Amino acid sequence: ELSEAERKAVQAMWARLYANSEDVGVAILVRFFVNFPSAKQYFSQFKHMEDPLEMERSPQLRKHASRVMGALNTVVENLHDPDKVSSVLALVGKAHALKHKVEPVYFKILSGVILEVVAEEFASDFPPETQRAWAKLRGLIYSHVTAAYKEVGW
């Protein structure tokens, strides 16, 4: 699926991202929660927050951003090892299905926001090959997370 060079393009860009994983990750989630306020129903501490300026200062938001960024870090850094990606993504899916009861589609939506922000951030380093690499990564995330929702009885 993901080629050598495509793996390498994602990984090189992810490293530039992760150098401010904390700012990037909350910016992403703030954007997500601003543009899809329905997604915020699952978070006790900011379900009724509207102000982006407050959302950005929320510890529960910031914690989720840090944990999402950590999981995807595991995925991106280990794209060469398909079994560590399956297991990370299966843990995540199952958790979201059962612990948190999150509709799977919000994964699609969040991923679209991620892609929007990565494109903005690397606008001067986003050639078709690199767009393709990210699109495949996004699609692979959704497959494994979908498969996990089915495995558990969603």
Ligand code: HEM
């Ligand atoms: C790439 C996509 C995502 C990843 C990798 C991810 C990962 C995680 C991780 C590692 C945790 C902490 C461990 C756990 O409690 O399961 C967590 C917690 C949580 N996640 Fe996500 N998540 C993602 C997307 C989402 C989405 C789309 C939602 C809902 C719209 C969501 C809702 C929650 C909730 C409600 C918690 C518990 C938060 C808390 O206890 O404060 N996650 N997530």
Ligand SMILES: [Xe]
């Ligand atoms: Xe994120």
Ligand SMILES: [Xe]
């Ligand atoms: Xe990612």
Ligand SMILES: [Xe]
């Ligand atoms: Xe990201």
Ligand SMILES: [Xe]
């Ligand atoms: Xe993504």
